[PDB]
């Protein structure tokens, strides 16, 4: 199998900033027949891969003119003159000179852009999920940057340890923020032995960390 | 407009049989040689197999790990290539996308996911989520619905039978105590809600269920 290795992993880089993708063959992609199999892609968040660059440097039809791809060889590079914020994704090359056809690990663009402070929700259970007597706690944590952000649950004063399922969202493509998901799942017997429900937030744009609570009782 | 319309994913248990088809539209079919590529978080992006055209007389080739397992076909007189796999294990499971590779360029389908599994389909359990005291966070309100215990991927979150798209965001699943769950939220300007209805509508064509529920007002 011919290895493709893509360097780096990660690239941040601001709107209007140049990119810069490297794919490295461990052997020669030159088919006997004269063309070189490489391809480079773009997989969007939620998306399937698509096609950018065919054969080294054949931009595909519907791709921006700011995207171009050179090499030869076993070294190939693929350039993006100016950032925009929909080529947010991972690209992957890939080799095709050769069975088995072979895809590098793939290289995820990240936007750098202005912080912004999460935008937060805390959610009790609904009626309907005490009926069935289990008793789930939502928070979401909306639109901020960078990605890099804690949450922690406090059940009376105390940090809640067990129960708690986090998700993030990839980065948006519109205007490049994250999202997060934190649920606290209790049986409904576990979620009347107590009162205070705290969501709390730490990210850098905020000295002092970010709170979002309510009471049972309170309701 | 060229589509790869892959089917027959799904939910199968390890050892059994499963098949995906994929037709083809918009662009020449027999100048393509057709390959599936799956892909999965452990060794993401993987080729497969390939069924080549009419001039090279439709030799297939596939990867040491599906050779003898794997079997790979196509029609060019219904514009269709399908994979027929066996005796399915772990290392399967993964979204298969159908693929058709030219001279000029090339194509990818949206993707079909295989689960490898001997868990039981689980219908998901849907419940919306509405603000401790709804006023105005900024000109905005975030409302939600939680996708809870189901099996297996994926599940379908849309709002307002699809009118609102700006403004929503469906958290990636996640596996608790073997079941998967899942929320989406979704921010509407203050004037907006309660004034009109606003549901999220779930589908897990797994189980065959279809939810709408729509968010109402909780004060407690
Ligand atoms: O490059 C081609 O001449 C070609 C033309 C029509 C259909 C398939 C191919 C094609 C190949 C044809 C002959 C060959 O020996 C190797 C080929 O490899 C290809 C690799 C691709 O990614 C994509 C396409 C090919």
């Known amino acids: 199998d011919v290895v493709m290795t893509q360097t780096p992993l990660s690239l941040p880089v601001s709107l209007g900033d140049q990119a810069s993708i490297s794919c490295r063959s461990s052997?020669?992609?030159?088919?006997?027949?004269?063309?070189?199999?490489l391809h480079w892609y773009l997989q969007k968040p939620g998306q399937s891969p698509k096609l950018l660059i065919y054969?080294?440097?054949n931009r595909f039809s519907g791709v921006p003119d700011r995207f171009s791809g050179s090499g030869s060889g076993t070294d190939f590079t693929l350039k993006i003159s100016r950032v925009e914020a929909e080529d947010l994704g991972v690209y992957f090359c890939?080799?095709?000179?050769?069975?088995?056809?072979?895809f590098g690990g793939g290289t995820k663009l990240e936007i750098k852009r202005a912080d912004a402070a999460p935008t937060v929700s805390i959610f009790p259970p609904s009626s309907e999920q005490l009926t069935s007597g289990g008793a789930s706690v939502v928070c979401f944590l909306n639109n901020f940057y960078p990605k890099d952000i804690n949450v922690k649950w406090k059940i009376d004063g105390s940090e809640r340890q067990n129960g708690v399922l986090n998700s993030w969202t990839d980065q948006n493509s519109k205007d490049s923020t994250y999202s997060m998901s934190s649920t606290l799942t209790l049986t409904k017997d576990e979620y009347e032995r107590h009162n205070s429900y705290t969501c709390e937030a730490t990210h850098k744009t905020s000295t002092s960390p970010i709170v979002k609570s309510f009471n049972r009782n309170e309701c | 407009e060229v589509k790869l319309d892959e089917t027959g994913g799904g939910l199968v248990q390890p050892g059994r049989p499963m098949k995906l088809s994929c037709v083809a539209s918009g662009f020449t079919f027999s100048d393509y040689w057709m390959n599936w590529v799956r892909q999965s978080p452990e060794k993401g992006l993987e080729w497969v197999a390939q069924?080549?055209?009419?001039?090279?007389?439709?030799?297939?080739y596939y990867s040491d790990s599906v050779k003898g397992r794997f079997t790979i076909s196509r029609d060019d007189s219904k514009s269709s290539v399908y994979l027929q796999m066996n005796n399915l294990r772990a290392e399967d499971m993964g979204i298969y996308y159908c693929?058709?590779?030219?001279?000029?360029?090339?194509?990818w389908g949206q993707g079909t996911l295989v689960t490898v599994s001997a868990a039981k389909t689980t219908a998901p359990s849907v419940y919306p989520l509405a603000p401790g005291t709804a006023a105005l966070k900024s000109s905005m309100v975030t409302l939600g619905c939680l996708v809870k215990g189901y099996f297996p991927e994926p599940v379908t979150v849309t709002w307002n039978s699809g009118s609102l798209s700006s403004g929503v965001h469906t958290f990636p699943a996640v596996l608790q105590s073997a079941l998967y769950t899942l929320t989406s939220s979704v921010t509407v300007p203050s004037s907006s809600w309660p004034s009109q209805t606003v549901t999220c509508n779930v589908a897990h064509p797994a189980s065959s269920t279809k939810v709408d529920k729509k968010i109402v007002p909780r004060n407690c």
């Open positions: 052997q020669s992609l030159v088919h006997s027949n004269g063309n070189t199999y």
């Open positions: 054969k080294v440097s």
């Open positions: 069924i080549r055209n009419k001039p090279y007389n439709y030799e297939t």
């Open positions: 693929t058709s590779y030219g001279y000029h360029g090339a194509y």
């Open positions: 890939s080799q095709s000179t050769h069975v088995p056809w072979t």
